[PDB]
Symmetry: D3
Subunit: 335 residues, 6 copies
């Protein structure tokens, strides 16, 4: 495959986390999210009916998909992966399946995924899509309800405060997860990377059904290990996992998110953050320096691991200034 | 006067800075404001036509005047002073003089000063108004154009980038400044404090005209020294000025902002910030500890100086969590 | 005066009650207003913050001022009196004094009083204005707070639930009542009747100040007895008061609403309702018959008392069908 | 089947009629509907272009699906059946097939059926859907055009005033009826009851096609007799038909709406009203007492017939107070 | 077929061009279109991001489909063909495939194709649909990129200014062209004519796939020659081509637009304009006289060729007055 | 005076006509205005209720006051005069007196006069205001009702179709004309020219009262002869009046609009059009050539008459391309 050869040498990409959570920025009614601002809904058990009010404040006048891609491109990033739908269940694309999306429900009334797709295509960057296939806090049957003995960046993995009765992920799988994966893999042109996450609930068969649907719609799309149950083309390491020399040299619970796993094609990627948050967090100014970014990329890359470095856009659709400065500074260090 | 006796023993108040600048939060197009996020328009010479686009993003769904006043009251603050219009010229009340205001120009479509007024009244707090009488970057004849040999938190004191010709503050004084001062001193009930600022341009007679108008409309309102030209009832010290013991014990350019000045009624106030910014700034996490706040208040108060401590509300109308925590922590130190 | 001679022979007019209360139609959250639907805010102590939400639902697409005036005219009514502002304090005209009005605060965005004014003028009917000069539930200093030993159609005469502190009607008088009376007596052409109500609080001097302002702006406007303190040109009898023969034949607490009072010019008017409510009430189907309406009019008129017969428009701006049928039926009985 | 055993013992459910007709409440332009306010468009031959204007007034700020379900549940009702689309053709859910719906065409911009579905699920009530499969006054090929020798609550059964040419129900069946039945049986979770109506036009094969589609999408859904042509799992008796003892004891035109029909599974239901209208009607205050409701339910139930008792929500989305009072009163009579 | 016999005798129809281009009316930023005003995007290389702004100005309050069809009918026209989507790629109907359409993207929020379909049906006119299957300037893979050695009414046939990379029409064919053709041939009732255009890029197989889909959805639809590659039921002559007597008497590059081609069914049609533009152009006042129109129609018709005479609606949705006058004048010349 | 010396040498200015009439562009419901498109409301007796609908279509996305002024400046024009309110009574500025204005009543929600004022000031052009002091079709007492024996570009000079009763200009003078002249002469900075029109009704005293108000607010404003009754500082010739050499060389009904009148300060101006309409008219493509414009200007100027050359902006706020081309071409002919 072309995509396989390409990914092996790609080295460096940009990830984007952006959603209603970005407006709250890590705080809600005087209380804090963890370092995980995108988890605020679970962390503070914000009822859906309250969280939905954020749609009315979502008018990011400074969002510019071309300017974002241009930054990525100047830094030598070869691909961009963006959140189409995170755990809160809010879609950042025009979903016919679900009107809880950025196009229908906000005054912004624009398809953010569509604009980033088009921007990547003109600039020659490959395009990837993040989709939370398991957790969906907007759905009574969203995943996570079997996993609450394991600590999270929130409270429970599922929405356990609005939805307190019998739960069966199979229904959400059928009525929302699969139809939305169909939309994003159909309507945004060629997809090079599919970035799934926290496979806390879905079965082997469900992972497989997703894998086969993605391949039917996007034959060259490379699927990460967090689809779960070993149904994947490349290994995602843990959040900000930068392995020691020895571990990076050598390289299993298929549903854990940490550590190495087998990779028949020799493909690996660490997704990381510039500060310590995925979603934009007001409080978090612990931005890595140009030098650290440069060194992390060099280290990952020389052991054949791609560096997928995340930007959490703010409520106005901006790359934080300190993120842009860190990225452009790392670029300036490259001889 | 009752107001005079009250102010002398008031000790502690809350100041609020809030405006379009709060949405930008210290950055614009990848460049930084100084420590002064509310000066961003001058610091980066943002054309009015661009800055005005912020009105369309101004929908602060979490703004709650009662909850802000309640925090003030729990911390033992006896008065609240809010920005009705800062240097950028944007009014935070329904101005019939000028449609560049929060009621007419934004989807929020509410009178912020009106809501704060009513909240202070129900809670028994005294109400005060900040108004930038000299600088107004939305007006070709706004003040500051004689002062650009003095360094600022921005570039120029005036809007020198949209407006580059002959200037005469007398026109803005007549057509905007005085009619707006009339509005705010007529429509929001009893006003106990009038907080003017940076008298870089206005004449003795202009300062006097303001003083007399405020008194005609608000006989019990105390006017601060920054009205300029010696036309005042109490002395504002410098920004965050905490005077040494022997200066605080003893106590002249009437148009400078720093140091003591004469006060025939023995009234003084230092306005300070919890971090280092007046307006909300994402980048500023340098929040003073409860202990520092407590000690500053004790020191000012034992020399008969009031502590007016500022909160810069964020884009959603909220008291930053770290500000609320610092204030409640200082309160908890009053054993 | 022309107006004096005209009113004596006018015999029959239409009153209109219409406001936010008309949407609720006599119930709120499963609880009933009295027979007085327009008093629902007081009856159920609806916080202003909740009651104001009705502005969002106020889009009465079937309101037609010409059609309403035409009905009046076909029934032989010679004048129309409309609520410009009822006790809830919501203005049904474009008030620059207060944005709590039908033009600024609702999607309808139209001046109802302006449209009715123009309609009366084209059809040749005289125009009159109701204004609640004393009670204003939207104002902390609204009237009624001295009268709560007298039972009402609500709970208290004042808003005693949002505003629980010290009150002084003088402030509302100055800042809202008088400025709004100036607006309505300045902006809507010639006013023939001024209908004030429930003078529970205002002083002799305040009644006089109103009287003199109305005459300065509208020299020929006839003022009713409910301005209070004997400041009036004609006597309003009680709500639906149809006096016995011998009382009607011969004809004192100036601030009560019931019974005869002296009338230097020999002018009298009974305001009444077709059913038992002033504001539209879903529940009230006790519509008087054509015969009753005809007989009430004949009785009042033969003793030189005018009959001002009220329609409460529904939430879509319509004359209820049973009201229209009753009025046209009474008309048909006049030969 | 579980559903069969459940329905036999269910005894008591809530029906909801709600649409644009609810705003008019039984009147339009000074003319009356019959006791059937939901038939107003036919009764008064309101052109589609005029009737559609009601969408602009549809902002029911008091609609609260949780509170409606809670009332049902407290009265011991075990299921709730709601109008997804009545004869006027207006959908009360987000239909991709037709933008003439409450989500796309009104300022309310919400999926009413979706909110009721979610509320039923959290409370543990079963959910049922009414759909007018035959009559559709918004469609040129809507049913009814062969039936106009039979008297209606309106004028004609079809829209005969906008559409006066050759008609063929087969086209509406294919392009609107079947696609919409697919939507409502796909997107709102498990449906326990399907409530079809007035089978004036559809063929045996069309009834069968509907029956089979419902079963394919909702294997356990019980379908009522008004799907027509004998394609049903339970018998709906006539509107408010409370059968005499010996008829109720013993128990054929498959397309009539009155009387008993065979029921293989022994299932029966009478749908009734609290007053005399299905849709909200201002004029109709003829509310049955608690005692009548209790006695009707006891009578129906002791002959193994379910009582499906209708609420017609008003223009603001509320259960009329007198309806709520009647239902809570009947509940109170059950020791 | 019925349609074949009907078309042969139909003689005269109306064409409608209407879109965003109609607002610009032949000019943009002080530069001219060619008198093909609908080509202005290509002629002046207007970036999509700029051209899209026109959606915000699209509120044609005088559009009236019934009045347009009435005009057609009074002139004896037996069918109407309207632009569902022209070269700029903007849909004039509610497309679920693409939100760049008149319903979703403009304040008008109405389905223009839908309203015209309904109007034709009530008046008894046959309905036809224009769709640009090949050129689409809103799509990176839109057609025309192989044809830029042939001169156009614009610059390039494709959008070569926003999209400068690798291009493959197959992708647009699959993702936009075919799904939209399915929409228009499914949702707007019976279609008698399908009017395709400028087959610069699509293959024989693509033409065939379209032809077969149209026939599957619309078995009686007649397809014109500009579908290309010989896949058609009738011949469209060139733009405003009025053939000389001996060519009209006798009657091959299947993908050219000029001249005769074979027609097994003996069906032909010339589409023409009243002035010289398809889309509305301010500059074009060169309106043909009644006499010319009459003579063109008589000439075409006596050789068995239908005359499809275009109206370009203005930005308010109106038939230009001079167009209406020309058409009514031609009608009056038929004694 | 400085203004007098400046105007005498000014030579050349730009006039702007822009309003609701510009959208109709000379046509309404299939009928024509004369070559006076701004007169369409009178010409076709458009009821106010219908004409007001145009506000909903008024969203001129291409309006750019800086670019208009820059064109003026590049042509050597020294001043710009704009319609603040034409005969239709619609204000193009934010009027507190009357909400029938471009700020309050349209989605554009911008102060056109304000933007032009600011643009003139930055570019160094003097600013002037046109105001229809006599005719006002939106006011029952608007002028013209004494003049209907004199032919107009419309039907009657007044609105005689909505308002058919007793009329008295004195009321409109007091309640709209004078208050609005105060607004425009107070809120837009220094005004160099006041351009009044068609003094068909107002008295000498009324003319004088206007003159004296303008001078009180704008001491250096030059007032034209069409204020009427000899109350003026300079003479406006007739519309498009280019006097013969001998009349221009040596130079009375004070209320006629044609021919010379005395000018004690020697000031004269001809206002003309580039085509033959003041307001934008679709049909009017009779644009004068560069040569004609140049020769007109030279002729007027060498006899000491200023040339005030009008642009009628289109519905999108543009200078028509042919007008821009004519003006730039005339400029190019100046050696
Ligand atoms: C239960 C009833 O069913 C049909 O007979 C309708 O025509 C009614 O008006 C109502 O929805
Ligand atoms: C009928 C005409 O056909 C093609 O040749 C288009 O490119 C035209 O500009 C228009 O639609
Ligand atoms: C200069 C012209 O003046 C008058 O004659 C008006 O009636 C015209 O409409 C235009 O404003």
């Amino acid at each position: 495959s072309d995509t396989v050869e390409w990914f092996k040498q790609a080295k460096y990409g940009m990830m984007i986390h952006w959603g209603l959570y970005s407006l709250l920025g890590g705080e809600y009614q005087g209380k804090s999210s963890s370092n995980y601002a995108e988890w605020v809904q679970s962390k503070l058990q914000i009822p859906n009916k309250e969280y939905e009010r954020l749609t009315q404040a979502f008018n990011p006048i400074y969002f510019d998909a071309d300017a974002i891609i241009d930054l990525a491109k100047r830094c030598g990033m070869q691909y961009l992966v963006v959140t189409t739908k995170h755990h809160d269940g809010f879609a950042m694309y025009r979903s016919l399946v679900d009107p809880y999306n950025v196009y229908d429900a906000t005054p912004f009334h624009r398809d953010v995924i569509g604009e980033l797709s088009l921007a990547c295509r003109k600039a020659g960057l490959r395009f990837g899509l993040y989709y939370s296939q398991d957790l969906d806090w907007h759905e009574p049957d969203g995943g996570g309800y079997l996993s609450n003995d394991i600590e999270t960046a929130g409270t429970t993995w599922d929405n356990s405060w609005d939805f307190t009765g019998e739960k069966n992920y199979d229904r959400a799988f059928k009525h929302k997860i699969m139809p939305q994966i169909e939309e994003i893999m159909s309507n945004y042109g060629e997809i090079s990377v599919a970035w799934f996450d926290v496979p806390m609930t879905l079965s082997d068969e469900q992972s497989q059904t997703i894998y086969d649907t993605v391949k039917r719609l996007q034959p060259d799309c490379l699927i990460n290990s967090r689809l779960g149950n070993g149904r994947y083309d490349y290994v995602s390491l843990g959040d900000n996992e930068i392995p020691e020399d020895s571990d990076a040299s050598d390289k299993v619970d298929y549903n854990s998110i940490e550590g190495f796993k087998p990779s028949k094609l020799g493909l690996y990627e660490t997704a990381g953050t510039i500060n310590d948050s995925w979603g934009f967090a007001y409080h978090d100014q612990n931005w890595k320096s140009p030098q650290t970014i440069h060194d992390y990329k060099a280290h990952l890359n020389k052991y054949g691991i791609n560096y997928l470095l995340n930007v959490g856009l703010d409520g106005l659709g901006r790359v934080p200034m300190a993120a842009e400065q860190a990225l452009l500074g790392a670029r300036a260090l490259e001889a």
